[PDB]
Design a protein around this motif. Structure first.
Motif, PDB file in Angstrom:
ATOM      1  N   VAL A  50      44.991  43.611  44.357  1.00  0.00           N
ATOM      2  CA  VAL A  50      45.361  42.516  43.487  1.00  0.00           C
ATOM      3  C   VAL A  50      44.271  42.281  42.465  1.00  0.00           C
ATOM      4  O   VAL A  50      43.094  42.208  42.810  1.00  0.00           O
ATOM      5  CB  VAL A  50      45.567  41.243  44.275  1.00  0.00           C
ATOM      6  N   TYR A  64      45.997  36.402  39.205  1.00  0.00           N
ATOM      7  CA  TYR A  64      47.138  35.554  39.469  1.00  0.00           C
ATOM      8  C   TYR A  64      47.948  35.454  38.183  1.00  0.00           C
ATOM      9  O   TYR A  64      47.380  35.336  37.101  1.00  0.00           O
ATOM     10  CB  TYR A  64      46.688  34.155  39.867  1.00  0.00           C
ATOM     11  N   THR A  65      49.269  35.497  38.295  1.00  0.00           N
ATOM     12  CA  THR A  65      50.122  35.403  37.124  1.00  0.00           C
ATOM     13  C   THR A  65      51.152  34.297  37.229  1.00  0.00           C
ATOM     14  O   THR A  65      51.725  34.056  38.286  1.00  0.00           O
ATOM     15  CB  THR A  65      50.829  36.716  36.874  1.00  0.00           C
ATOM     16  N   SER A  67      48.105  34.451  32.853  1.00  0.00           N
ATOM     17  CA  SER A  67      47.466  35.179  33.941  1.00  0.00           C
ATOM     18  C   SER A  67      46.035  34.690  34.072  1.00  0.00           C
ATOM     19  O   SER A  67      45.274  34.695  33.102  1.00  0.00           O
ATOM     20  CB  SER A  67      47.489  36.690  33.679  1.00  0.00           C
ATOM     21  N   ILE A 102      40.664  36.077  39.246  1.00  0.00           N
ATOM     22  CA  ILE A 102      40.228  35.673  40.578  1.00  0.00           C
ATOM     23  C   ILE A 102      38.737  35.346  40.635  1.00  0.00           C
ATOM     24  O   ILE A 102      37.890  36.208  40.385  1.00  0.00           O
ATOM     25  CB  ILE A 102      40.516  36.780  41.587  1.00  0.00           C
ATOM     26  N   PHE A 156      44.627  26.160  38.014  1.00  0.00           N
ATOM     27  CA  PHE A 156      43.781  27.338  37.907  1.00  0.00           C
ATOM     28  C   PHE A 156      42.636  27.047  36.941  1.00  0.00           C
ATOM     29  O   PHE A 156      41.744  26.260  37.260  1.00  0.00           O
ATOM     30  CB  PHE A 156      44.584  28.550  37.446  1.00  0.00           C
TER      31      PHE A 156
END
Lengths: 49, 49, 49
Positions: B34, B37-38, B43, B46, C40
């Motif tokens: 991975v 994150y999307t 996106s 990490i 995020f």
């Protein structure tokens, strides 16, 4: 809308935290309130003011 | 004026309450399944602790 | 040509169907515990009604 104090989880180290904990206490114990100041300053004046 | 050589008792720290930090001694980069994150078209990358 | 002094019956409004609006008479700014929403790495601000 802001709280006077808060407890939060977050990276930190027990030692340092614990220290600042006591430092806190010590200061807090040294607290006075203006009303006390009134009595003090007034009494010192020997009753002229 | 207040001439007295008075000590600074009250001080504040808005940062992190820790005194130890974790550091890298020998770097390294490894392949991962991975990559991020999307969300829809966005996106995010990490970020490890 | 259509000379007749004809009235405009059909009209449209794509806006809001309200005729009263709430206004500020005396401004104000107060401190808050929460400052914004975060996702995020993104962060959106708080918009009140």
């Amino acid at each position: 809308a802001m709280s006077e104090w808060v407890d939060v989880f977050e990276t930190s180290d027990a030692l340092t935290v614990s220290i600042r904990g006591r430092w806190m206490a010590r200061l807090a114990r040294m607290n006075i309130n203006p009303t006390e100041i009134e009595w003090a300053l007034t009494e010192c004046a020997q009753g002229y003011v | 004026l207040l001439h007295a050589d008075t000590p600074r008792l009250v001080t504040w720290d808005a940062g992190l309450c820790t005194s130890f930090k974790i550091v890298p001694i020998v770097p390294a980069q490894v392949p991962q399944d991975v990559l991020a994150y999307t969300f829809f078209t966005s996106s995010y990358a990490i970020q490890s602790p």
